[PDB]
Design a protein around this ligand. Structure first.
Ligand SMILES: FC(F)(F)c1cnc[nH]1
Length: 175
């Protein structure tokens, strides 16, 4: 590893991680599952009605957006969503102990996973949660790769899975 390579981990954090997995879009679009989304992975609604999505957007941003936001607005919303995922983990009796047991990089993978799937979805992964607490990294990763979350949209989830396996940022290098 070069001096530069060793600096790479200090450039990576949960925000940079999700930014790569979710991308950045300033106009309403449909995600890999066909749900209306904007910014950095902000799910507006699961309704097929675009009108509902725009309504949710205006509520989320606080102005008349007509389906379009600024980069600064995308960032503020993203920060709010990241905070909600972290808070969702820490208050949950099932997820908190697992999260506490993890190293810093795998903690980012945990927040990412919750950001993507929500608290109850993640908390339902009983075997994976046990495997992670027991440092059974390869088993955890194989089991994550069986999930509908990963399988229906692999490109959004693949790096998170690799990150649970290795506890390094390697999956986010060389985009
Ligand atoms: F429990 C958490 F939050 F650490 C976790 C999230 N995904 C797997 N584990």
């Amino acid at each position: 590893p070069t001096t530069e390579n060793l600096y790479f981990q200090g450039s990576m954090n949960i925000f940079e991680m999700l930014r790569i997995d979710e991308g950045l879009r300033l106009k309403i679009y449909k995600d890999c599952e066909g749900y209306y989304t904007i910014g950095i992975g902000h799910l507006l609604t699961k309704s097929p009605d675009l009108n509902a999505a725009k309504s949710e957007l205006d509520k989320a941003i606080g102005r008349n957006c007509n389906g379009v936001i600024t980069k600064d607005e995308a960032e503020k919303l993203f920060n709010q969503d990241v905070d909600a995922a972290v808070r969702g983990i820490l208050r949950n009796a099932k997820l908190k102990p697992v999260y506490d047991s993890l190293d810093a990089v795998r903690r980012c993978a945990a927040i990412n996973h919750v950001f993507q799937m929500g608290v109850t979805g993640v908390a339902g992964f009983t075997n994976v949660l046990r495997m992670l607490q027991q440092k059974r990294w390869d088993e955890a990763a194989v089991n994550l790769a069986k999930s509908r979350w990963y399988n229906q949209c692999p490109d959004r989830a693949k790096r998170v899975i690799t990150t649970f396996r290795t506890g390094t940022w390697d999956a986010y290098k060389n985009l």
